[PDB]
Amino acid sequence: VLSEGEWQLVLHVWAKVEADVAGHGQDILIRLFKSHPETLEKFDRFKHLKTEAEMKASEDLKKHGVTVLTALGAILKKKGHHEAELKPLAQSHATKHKIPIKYLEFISEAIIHVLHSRHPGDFGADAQGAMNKALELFRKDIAAKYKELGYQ
């Protein structure tokens, strides 16, 4: 639904992220667990992490964070043509994990916040606008996909 130029802005940031997938990954997750602790319960496995440092220190978490961004990155470089990629994600989050759409709104926030913190000079209004939109297209697609699975 985005213009060619918005894609480029999106992808232009994405390239910075990609220079430190793991580091972004951790800030991203950690912010989420921090701004909305409830999301933390969906992780049977990270739920025992009581502090920031402890989160910062977890190999597992960090690993998990590369996984999330890898997948996310894969969709974004499809510039809207991402059915293939999107489908498998929706099935499990809908089926296995049960992540409500609100939860996606939360991670979406966490994303934009980390990028803005790390990449100011590359993350202005238009570029921040472009990323938002991108995150909305993904979330929209995901939601339809959820219903079709009989989730929401």
Binding site for ligand HEM (CB under 6 A): 39, 42-43, 45, 64, 67-68, 71-72, 89, 92-93, 96-97, 99, 103-104, 107
Alpha helices by DSSP H, listed for 58-124, are 59-76, 83-92, 101-118
Distance of closest approach, residue 81 Cβ to ligand HEM, in angstroms: 16
Distance of closest approach, residue 37 Cβ to ligand HEM, in angstroms: 11
What does the CA dihedral 30, 118, 116, 53 come to, rounded to 10 degrees?
A: 20
> For residues 56 and 63, which CB has a smaller minimum distance to ligand HEM in the complex?
63
Binding site members for O2: 64
> For residues 71 and 149, which CB has a smaller minimum distance to ligand HEM in the complex?
71
Distance of closest approach, residue 125 Cβ to ligand HEM, in angstroms: 22
> For residues 5 and 67, which CB has a smaller minimum distance to ligand HEM in the complex?
67
Binding site members for nitrite: 64
**Closest residue by Cα to residue 70 from 23, 18, 11:** 18
CB distance 52 to 30 below 8 Å: yes
Tell me how far CA of residue 122 lies from CA of 24, 72, 93, 130, 132, in angstroms. Answer: 15, 19, 31, 12, 14
